[PDB]
């Protein structure tokens, strides 16, 4: 599923990302935009053998288990397949655990390169929430 900007903003708010551990809602919508372009089925094979999964491109070397990644740690205790659903529940649960580490949202390269330091609030402006 490909979410509309405002559609995802409302969904993420319902899933409790509107100000979660210091991160405003705009950060999460902006992250999804540049990580997966709002596509829940997005996958990206990496050079180290890992793969990034879903709307928030969660990695299989550190966060989820896809059974094909060397050195997998499965920090989110969840199969990567659960992160490739139109239902963002699992991705949000894992994203919350990821951001509960001192590294915060820096775990998301796209967010770091295209969102951090920008007017992230603009990503939820003009939306019925």
């Amino acid at each position, epitope marked *: 599923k490909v979410f509309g900007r405002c559609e995802l903003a409302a969904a993420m708010k*319902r899933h*409790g990302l509107d100000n*979660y551990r210091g991160y405003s809602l705009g950060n999460w919508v902006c992250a999804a935009k540049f990580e997966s372009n709002f596509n829940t089925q997005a996958t990206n094979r990496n050079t180290d053998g890992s793969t990034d999964y879903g709307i928030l491109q969660i990695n299989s070397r550190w966060w989820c288990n896809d059974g094909r990644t060397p050195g997998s740690r499965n920090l989110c205790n969840i199969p990567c397949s659960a992160l490739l659903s139109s239902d963002i529940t699992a991705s949000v649960n894992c994203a919350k655990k990821i951001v509960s580490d*001192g590294n915060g949202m820096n775990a998301w390269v796209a967010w770091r390169n295209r969102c951090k330091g920008t007017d992230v609030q603009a990503w939820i402006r003009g939306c019925r929430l």
Partner: antibody
Amino acid sequence: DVQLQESGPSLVKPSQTLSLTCSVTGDSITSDYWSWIRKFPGNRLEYMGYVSYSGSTYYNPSLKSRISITRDTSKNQYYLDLNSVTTEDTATYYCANWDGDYWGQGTLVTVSA
Amino acid sequence: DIVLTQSPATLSVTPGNSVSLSCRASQSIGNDLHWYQQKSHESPRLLIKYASQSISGIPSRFSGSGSGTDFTLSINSVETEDFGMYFCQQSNSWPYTFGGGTKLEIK
């Protein structure tokens, strides 16, 4: 499957350092975030803190910098050190993973002169 | 810090009847409210996470609801094994905090 178990002194003196160990079996300590929670004699629960994968720690401000949570991957254990304890620190201490699915059996620690 | 207030402090019920337990946060915590059960001489057991998400291995009779500041844990047809303490816990902001607990007893 995963198993957690607390170990350490059950009786300590005021002003000393209370130290507990949580042994993890079934999976690596590098595969989760680890926490310490305690229950005071009056049924009050307090989340003491946790250590995440990067090594970053989060401690409850109520502990006024008296707490330290560390890890030892080689022994697959993590620890709780609480300095300058008082009678107010008498409680049942539990270790559990951040998700809350795995908990130790809990161990009572009494602080008395 | 976020203060969680649970009510009632104690609830008596006869097995077979249903009950609902309340937990209110001093400020909005979205859906970051979890429910735990705790019996004498035992570690807490996670029943519901993120307000209403089910947990594998927990009886189906347990359900959670709510968002923002008002949450509820419902038990459809209480069983004797359900008697004990129930605590809510928020993880929206650090430090994580627990409610004062609600004791469920046989009536």
